[PDB]
C-alpha cells in the first residue's frame, strides 16, 4: 500500500520493494542495540522477522530499554517475551516471533537455513566464527552480520560470502547529454554541446538514439574516454555515414561483483573504513584493543573492573602480545587501553542508536543488493568525551542503584547531574524529533525536580504516511496534535520527564511569545526543520542571545550535522546553500524537452485556472456591489482593473453539467490541438538560421497536433477530472453516474469544434447578461480550491498526471506514471528511518560535548552518505576575524550598545557612537526600514528628532537594535560593515 510506503518507494524502488517482501531474518539478543535494530527493521516492513533471547529481564536493563517497565522486572520474564507485544504495534503487516532456544557449541545450526540473514548481538567470538563458517558454506550463502557495543566503543563486521552481486553501485539516476558534433575518426570523437559539460569518467557505458546521418549508431553501446570537459572518445566511427545532427546519450548502469572474507581470515588483517583522516591508523589499534578485551574476557570469564590497575596492566600486556602477532604490527595506544579498561562495562545509548541505524541499512543492502555494502569492518567511538576529563576518580563512576548506572559508569555522576538540570529548547517535531525525545528520556535529561525543562512546538497534525517514519504515534492518533501525542508517549517511557508542548509555529510574527528573555532562560536550541528560511530566522534570533545552536538535515541516505557555539564558531548564514534552479520560461511555454517541464506547466495551468481567476472574480465583485453600477461606470468610460478578463469569464459561465462537458472539450482542443498549429504556422519546420542550422534542432523538438478520441483512457481520465473540477469550481452539483462513458458520449454527440486561424463587445455581453438575470449575488460568488496531495479522491493528482502525459505526447516524449509525477509535483522529500536514527545519535552524542563546556578542538561535524557508504568527520569552522579601520575589528558575536534618554536625538546618537567606539557612522536602518540616509532628500533635518518619535517602538521593548555602516577609508568603496548596535531608550 502506497499510503504507508510513499517515501520508502522513492528511496528503494518497486523491484527492491518486492524483494523486501517474502523475507525472513533471524535476530539474537534483545539488548538496547537489539531492541532498536528490531524497531528499525519492523519500521522497514519485512514480512517475517524472528527474534531470540534466553536471558531474563533485570532492573539494570531499565536504563537501556525504553519498552520495559517495573512489572516485567518484577516477574523476571524472558526479555524475548516481555516486548513481543509492543513491537507488533508498529506494523501489523510485519509478522514477529520470539524464541528462547539455548545456544552453545553443540546446538544444531540446520534450522537457521529458513532465513536469509542473521545478525548476532552479545555473543562469544568462537561461536560467532563457527556460525559464520556454517552460514558462508550454505548454498545459497546466508548473509552474516556481527555488531557489539562496550562502553564508548563499537565494532561492526559483515560477510556476504565469497562472491556477491550488486545491481546498483550508487542509485543516482543516469544523466542525459546531447550531441553537438561527431567525427568519423578511428577512434571516433563526439563533442558535447556548447557549455553543459558531460561530467563523465572514462570507462563508463552509454547508449544512443535519434541520430541523423550516423543512424547505425542508434541503439548501440560504447565505452567512453573523456578528453576535454566538452568532448571525449568513443569507438571507431570511420565506417559510417557523416554526422548530420541529433543524438541523445544516457549512461547505462552495470551490476558489479564484490568479494568478502571469512571472519577468522579478516581477524589477521581487518579491512576497516577510514572515517577520520587525522588518525587513519586508529581503527587498527581499536581492533587490536577490542581483540585483547575479548581475550581477557575469555580467559577470566569476566569483564575488567573499573579502576583495577592490575587488570589494566594485564590487558596492556595482552594487547602487546596480540599487536605484534598482527600482519602489519601496529603500535599500541596506552591511553586507548586504559580508557577501555576504565569503562569496559558501561553502555551508551546514542552510539548504539547510530550503530543500529547503519546496521539496519546494511541489512537492507544484504536483502536487496541495492547499494554497495561495507567491506569489511567499521569502528565508531567518542573518546573525546573522556579526553578532556583528565584523570577522574573511579568513585564517581560507581553505580548507586538507579536506571542511570550504565551512563554513570560511562561518564561519571556529576556530568549526569548537570544533565538533569538542563533547560533545552527544541523546534519542530518531525521524525528526528521523536528520536530526540527517546534519547533524552533514555538519558534522563531534565529529570531533576528543581530544574530541567523541555519545550517543543509544532502546528502539524498527525498524518497517515508519517507513521511510517514516526514511531511515537499510532494509527488511531490520526488528526491529532503532534506535540501532545509525542509528550504523552515520552512520559509513558519515563515518568520523571517534564515536557512543555505547544502547537505554535516559529515565525517572525510569533516573536512576542518567544521574547529574548525566553531564549536566555533556555540553555541550548535544537533544530529539526525542513526549510532553510526557518533555519536562517532561528539562527539570527539565537545570535542576539548568544546561545549554542545545533542543526541537522537529511535526504535519503545522506545527512549532515552542524554545531554552533558562541564566540568560537561561525553561523549558519556564514555559508550559502544551492538555490533551486529554474528552466527558462520560453522552454516551459513553447519547447519543453523534459517530462518535468510538462509537469510544471500543467501545475501552473491548474493554479492559474482554478485559484487566481476565482480569487480575482470574487475580489472584483466584492469591490462593486451592483453589476448594473459596473455597466454604468463602463459606459461612462471609467477605467476598471482586470475588467476584461472577469467579464469574459462571466460571459462564458456554464449552467449545467453538459455545459461543463462542452467547456472541458473546448479547453482540451485549445490546449492540445491549436497551439501546435499556431507554432507550426509561425515557425515552419525547414526554416534555418544565419549559419544555416535548422530552427527545429536539439534540444528543441517539433511538436505535433493530436486529435481527440474518447476511446483513449488518457482522454477519458483527463475529461472526467476536468469536468469534476469545473463542476466543483462553479458549485454546480452532479452525479457519479454522469461520469459513465456512455452518458458522456451521448453528451458530446452534438457539440461542434471551431476551426483554427472590444469594449463594445464586452458592454454588449454584460448588458445581455443583465437582461438575462444572470447577475445575481449567487452568481457573484466563485469556488476557490487549494492543491492537495494527500487527498486520494479530489482527482488533483489524476488530472495533473493526465495533463502531463498529454503534453508529453504533444512533443512525443515518453510519459510518466502516477507516483513519479506526484513526487515531482509535490516536492516530496524521500526519507528513511536509518539515516534519521544515525543523525539523531550523532546529535545526542555531541549534546554532552556541548554540556561539558569542552574546548573547541573536541567538537566534530559529520557528513555521510550511506549509499557509498561513506562517513567523514571534521572540525567546525573557527570564527573569522573582521577588521574595518584603525585596527578596530569585530566578529559575528559582536553587538554594541548606546544608552539614551527621553530627549535623545540623532546627532546625540551619532556623536556618542563616535566617542565611545572612536569612529563616526554614515548610515542607519532599523532592519529593512531605513531611518536616515544622507543621500535621500530631507534627511539632514532628521538629526534633530527624538529617537522615541523617529523609531515609534513598542512599549514592551525597553530597547531597539539597528544596523550601522561607516564610510570606507577610500572613496568609491562600499561602506564598511559593522556590528549591530542596541540602543536603550533609558537606563
Amino acid at each position: 500500500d502506497d499510503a504507508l510506503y510513499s517515501r520508502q518507494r522513492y528511496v528503494l524502488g518497486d523491484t527492491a520493494m518486492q524483494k523486501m517482501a517474502k523475507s525472513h531474518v533471524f535476530l539474537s539478543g534483545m539488548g538496547g542495540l537489539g531492541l532498536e535494530i528490531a524497531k528499525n527493521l519492523v519500521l522497514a516492513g519485512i514480512k517475517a522477522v524472528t527474534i531470540h533471547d534466553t536471558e531474563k529481564c533485570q532492573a539494570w536493563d531499565l536504563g537501556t530499554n525504553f519498552f520495559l517497565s517495573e512489572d516485567d522486572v518484577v516477574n523476571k520474564r524472558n526479555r524475548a517475551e516481555a516486548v513481543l507485544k509492543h513491537i507488533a504495534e508498529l506494523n501489523p503487516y510485519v509478522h514477529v516471533t520470539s524464541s528462547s532456544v539455548p545456544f552453545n557449541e553443540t546446538t544444531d545450526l540446520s534450522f537457521l537455513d529458513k532465513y536469509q540473514c542473521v545478525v548476532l548481538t552479545e555473543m562469544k567470538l568462537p561461536l560467532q566464527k563457527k556460525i559464520n563458517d556454517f552460514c558462508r558454506s550454505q548454498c545459497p550463502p546466508i548473509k552474516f552480520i556481527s555488531a557489539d557495543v562496550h562502553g564508548i566503543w563499537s565494532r561492526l563486521f559483515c560477510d556476504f560470502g565469497d562472491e556477491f552481486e550488486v545491481l546498483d553501485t550508487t542509485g543516482e539516476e543516469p544523466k542525459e547529454i546531447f550531441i553537438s558534433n561527431i567525427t568519423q575518426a578511428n577512434p571516433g570523437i563526439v563533442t558535447c554541446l556548447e557549455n553543459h559539460p558531460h561530467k563523465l569518467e572514462t570507462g563508463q557505458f552509454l547508449t544512443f538514439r535519434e541520430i541523423n546521418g550516423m543512424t547505425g549508431l542508434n541503439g548501440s553501446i560504447q565505452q567512453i574516454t573523456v578528453i576535454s570537459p566538452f568532448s571525449f572518445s568513443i569507438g571507431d566511427t570511420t565506417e559510417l555515414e557523416p554526422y548530420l545532427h541529433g543524438g541523445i546519450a544516457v549512461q547505462v548502469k552495470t551490476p558489479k561483483t564484490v568479494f568478502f572474507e571469512s571472519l577468522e581470515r579478516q581477524l589477521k588483517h581487518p579491512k576497516c573504513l577510514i572515517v577520520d583522516f587525522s588518525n587513519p591508523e586508529a581503527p587498527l589499534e581499536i581492533h587490536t584493543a577490542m581483540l585483547a578485551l575479548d581475550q581477557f574476557q575469555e580467559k577470566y570469564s569476566r569483564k575488567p573492573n573499573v579502576g583495577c590497575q592490575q587488570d589494566s596492566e594485564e590487558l596492556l600486556k595482552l594487547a602487546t602480545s596480540i599487536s605484534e602477532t598482527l600482519e602489519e604490527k601496529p603500535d599500541v595506544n596506552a591511553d586507548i587501553v586504559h580508557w577501555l579498561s576504565w569503562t569496559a562495562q558501561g553502555f551508551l545509548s546514542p552510539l548504539a542508536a547510530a550503530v543500529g541505524g547503519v546496521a539496519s541499512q546494511e541489512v537492507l543492502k544484504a536483502v536487496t543488493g541495492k547499494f554497495s555494502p561495507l567491506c569489511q569492518w567499521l569502528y565508531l567511538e567518542a573518546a573525546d568525551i573522556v579526553e578532556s576529563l583528565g584523570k577522574p576518580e573511579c568513585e564517581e563512576f560507581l553505580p548507586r542503584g538507579d536506571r542511570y548506572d550504565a551512563l554513570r559508569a560511562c561518564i561519571g555522576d556529576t556530568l549526569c547531574q548537570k544533565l538533569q538540570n538542563l533547560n533545552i529548547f527544541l523546534v519542530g517535531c518531525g521524525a528526528i524529533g521523536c528520536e530526540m525525545l527517546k534519547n533524552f528520556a533514555l538519558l534522563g535529561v531534565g529529570t531533576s525536580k528543581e530544574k530541567g525543562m523541555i519545550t517543543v512546538t509544532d502546528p502539524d497534525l498527525i498524518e497517515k504516511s508519517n507513521l511510517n517514519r514516526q514511531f511515537l504515534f499510532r494509527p488511531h492518533h490520526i488528526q491529532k496534535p503532534k506535540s501532545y501525542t509525542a509528550a504523552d508517549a515520552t512520559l509513558k517511557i519515563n515518568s520523571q520527564i517534564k515536557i512543555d508542548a505547544h502547537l505554535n509555529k516559529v515565525c517572525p510574527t510569533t516573536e512576542t511569545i518567544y521574547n529574548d528573555e525566553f531564549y536566555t532562560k533556555q540553555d541550548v536550541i535544537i533544530t529539526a526543520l525542513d526549510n532553510v528560511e526557518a533555519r536562517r530566522y532561528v539562527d539570527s534570533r539565537c545570535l542576539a542571545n548568544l546561545r549554542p545552536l545545533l542543526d541537522s538535515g537529511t535526504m535519503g541516505t545522506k545527512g549532515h550535522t552542524e554545531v554552533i557555539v558562541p564566540h568560537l564558531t561561525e553561523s549558519y548564514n556564514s555559508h550559502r546553500d544551492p538555490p533551486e534552479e529554474e528552466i527558462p520560461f520560453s522552454t516551459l511555454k513553447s519547447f519543453p524537452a523534459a517530462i518535468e517541464h510538462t509537469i510544471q506547466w500543467a501545475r501552473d495551468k491548474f493554479e492559474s485556472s482554478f485559484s487566481h481567476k476565482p480569487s480575482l472574480f470574487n475580489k472584483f465583485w466584492q469591490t462593486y456591489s451592483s453589476a448594473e453600477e459596473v455597466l454604468q461606470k463602463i459606459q461612462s468610460g471609467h477605467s476598471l482593473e482586470g475588467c476584461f478578463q472577469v467579464i469574459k469569464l462571466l460571459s462564458r459561465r456554464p449552467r449545467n453539467w453538459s455545459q461543463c462537458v462542452e467547456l472541458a472539450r473546448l479547453k482540451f482542443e485549445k490546449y492540445f490541438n491549436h497551439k501546435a498549429l499556431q507554432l507550426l504556422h509561425c515557425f515552419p519546420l525547414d526554416i534555418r538560421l544565419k549559419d544555416g542550422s535548422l530552427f527545429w534542432q536539439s534540444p528543441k523538438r517539433p511538436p505535433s497536433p493530436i486529435k481527440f478520441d474518447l476511446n483513449e483512457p488518457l482522454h477519458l481520465s483527463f475529461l472526467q477530472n476536468a469536468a469534476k473540477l469545473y463542476a466543483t469550481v462553479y458549485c454546480i452539483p452532479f452525479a457519479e453516474e454522469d461520469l459513465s462513458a456512455d452518458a458522456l458520449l451521448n453528451i458530446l454527440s452534438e457539440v461542434k469544434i471551431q476551426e483554427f486561424k472590444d469594449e463594445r463587445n464586452a458592454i454588449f455581453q454584460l448588458e445581455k447578461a443583465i437582461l438575462s438575470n444572470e447577475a445575481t449575488k449567487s452568481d457573484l460568488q466563485m469556488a476557490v480550491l487549494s492543491f492537495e496531495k494527500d487527498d486520494d479522491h479530489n482527482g488533483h493528482i489524476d488530472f495533473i498526471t493526465a495533463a502531463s502525459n498529454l503534453r508529453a505526447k504533444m512533443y512525443s516524449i515518453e510519459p510518466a506514471d502516477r507516483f513519479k509525477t506526484k513526487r515531482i509535483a509535490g516536492k516530496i522529500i524521500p526519507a528513511i528511518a536509518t539515516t534519521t536514527a544515525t543523525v539523531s545519535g550523532l546529535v545526542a552524542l555531541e549534546m554532552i560535548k556541548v554540556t561539558g563546556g569542552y574546548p573547541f578542538e573536541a567538537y566534530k561535524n559529520c557528513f555521510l552518505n550511506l549509499a557509498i557508504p561513506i562517513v567523514v568527520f571534521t572540525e567546525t569552522t573557527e570564527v573569522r576575524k573582521t577588521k574595518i579601520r584603525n585596527g578596530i575589528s569585530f566578529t559575528i558575536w559582536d553587538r554594541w550598545t548606546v544608552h539614551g534618554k527621553e530627549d535623545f536625538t540623532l546627532l546625540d546618537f551619532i556623536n556618542a557612537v563616535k566617542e565611545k567606539y572612536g569612529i563616526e557612522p554614515t548610515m542607519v536602518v532599523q532592519g529593512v526600514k531605513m531611518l536616515y540616509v544622507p543621500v535621500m532628500p530631507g534627511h539632514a533635518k532628521r538629526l534633530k528628532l527624538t529617537m522615541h518619535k523617529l523609531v515609534k517602538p513598542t512599549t514592551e521593548k525597553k530597547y531597539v537594535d539597528l544596523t550601522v555602516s561607516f564610510a570606507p577609508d577610500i572613496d568609491g568603496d562600499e561602506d564598511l560593515p559593522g556590528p549591530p548596535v542596541r540602543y536603550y531608550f533609558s537606563h
Binding site: 536562517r536 538555490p579 520560461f585 478578463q645 515557425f683 534555418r688 548610515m923 529593512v928 562600499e974
Partner: protein, 291 residues
C-alpha cells in the same frame, strides 16, 4: 532650444520618493497605490537581510546622478520614504522608434537575498494583458532576457553579484528591446532580412504596435496617471504637445500608404481606422491640458 528646456525641467524630477505603504498600530501594511508583488512583500517580513541594505545604499549614490537624461529618451524612478526594497520605474520610448514619446511603468522588487539574486522586473502598462508589444515581451509584462534568468547558458550571461548592477540592467533595455525594428528582435526572422515578406511582416507589426501604443501609452496615461508620476506625465506632454501631434499626423500619413496592398490591406485599414479614432480624442485631450 526646446530640448534644453525639457532637459532642465525633467532634471529636477529625475529622482524622488513617495509614501506607498502605511502601518497601523498592529503593523499591518496598507498599500496606498497599486503594486504587483504586495503578497510577496507582506509574506517576506524577515529583516535578516543586511548586505542588501549596504548594496542599495552604495547604488543610490550612483542612481542619483548617473541616470540617462535626454530629449530622445529618459528614465524616472520613485522609492518609498521609509522602505527602500520597493521601486517604481518609468521609461519613455526613445526617438526614431514606433515608441516615440511613449510611457511605460514597471514594478521592480528586490528579494531578501539580494544581491545574490537578480531583482524582479515586470511591466504594468500592458493594456490589460491584451497586447504583446515585443517578441521578447509578453501580455503579462514578463520579459525574455537570459541575463535575468538564472539558467545554464553562459557565465557571462548570469546575474553576477560582484559585477552586475541594476542601473546596467536598465541601460540594457533601451537599445536592445526598445528598438526601431522590434519585429526583428524575434530570432529566426532576421534570417529573412532583406526579403519583401519580412518587410511586409515588419510593417504590419509596426502598424499594430503604433496603434497599440497610441492607445495605451498616451491616452490611458493622461486620463488615468499613476499618482507617483502624475506631475511628471503632465509636465512632459504639455511641453511636447505640438511635436507629438505633428509626429502623430506623420504616422497617420505613413500608414495609409500601404492600404492599397492586398496581402496586408485589411490589417493596414484596421490600424488606420483605429489610429485615426485614437488621434481624434487625443487632440482634444491635449487641448484641455493645463500648464
Amino acid at each position: 532650444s526646446l530640448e534644453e528646456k525639457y532637459v532642465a525641467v525633467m532634471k529636477k524630477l529625475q529622482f524622488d520618493t513617495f509614501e506607498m505603504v502605511s502601518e497601523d498600530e498592529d503593523g499591518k501594511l496598507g498599500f496606498k497605490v497599486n503594486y504587483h508583488y504586495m503578497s510577496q512583500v507582506k509574506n517576506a517580513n524577515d529583516a535578516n537581510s543586511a548586505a542588501r541594505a549596504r548594496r542599495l545604499a552604495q547604488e543610490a549614490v550612483t542612481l542619483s546622478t548617473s541616470l540617462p537624461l535626454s530629449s530622445s529618451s529618459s528614465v524616472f524612478v520613485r522609492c518609498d520614504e521609509e522602505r527602500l526594497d520597493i521601486m517604481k520605474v518609468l521609461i519613455t520610448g526613445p526617438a526614431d522608434t514606433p515608441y516615440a514619446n511613449g510611457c511605460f511603468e514597471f514594478d521592480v522588487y528586490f528579494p531578501q537575498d539580494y544581491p545574490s539574486s537578480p531583482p524582479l522586473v515586470n511591466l504594468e502598462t500592458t493594456g490589460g494583458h491584451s497586447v504583446r508589444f515585443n517578441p521578447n515581451l509578453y501580455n503579462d509584462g514578463k520579459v525574455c532576457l537570459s541575463i535575468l534568468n538564472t539558467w545554464h547558458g553562459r557565465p557571462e550571461e548570469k546575474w553576477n553579484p560582484q559585477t552586475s548592477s541594476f542601473l546596467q540592467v536598465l541601460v540594457s533595455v533601451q537599445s536592445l528591446i526598445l528598438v526601431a525594428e522590434p519585429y526583428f528582435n524575434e530570432p529566426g526572422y532576421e534570417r529573412s532580412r532583406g526579403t519583401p515578406s519580412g518587410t511586409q511582416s515588419s510593417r504590419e507589426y509596426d502598424g499594430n504596435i503604433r496603434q497599440a501604443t497610441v492607445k495605451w501609452a498616451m491616452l490611458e496615461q493622461i486620463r488615468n496617471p499613476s499618482p507617483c508620476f502624475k506631475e511628471v506625465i503632465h509636465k512632459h506632454f504639455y511641453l511636447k504637445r505640438v511635436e507629438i501631434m505633428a509626429q502623430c499626423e506623420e504616422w497617420i500619413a505613413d500608414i495609409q500608404q500601404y492600404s492599397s496592398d492586398k496581402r496586408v490591406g485589411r490589417t493596414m485599414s484596421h490600424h488606420a481606422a483605429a489610429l485615426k479614432r485614437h488621434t481624434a480624442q487625443l487632440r482634444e485631450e491635449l487641448l484641455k491640458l493645463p500648464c
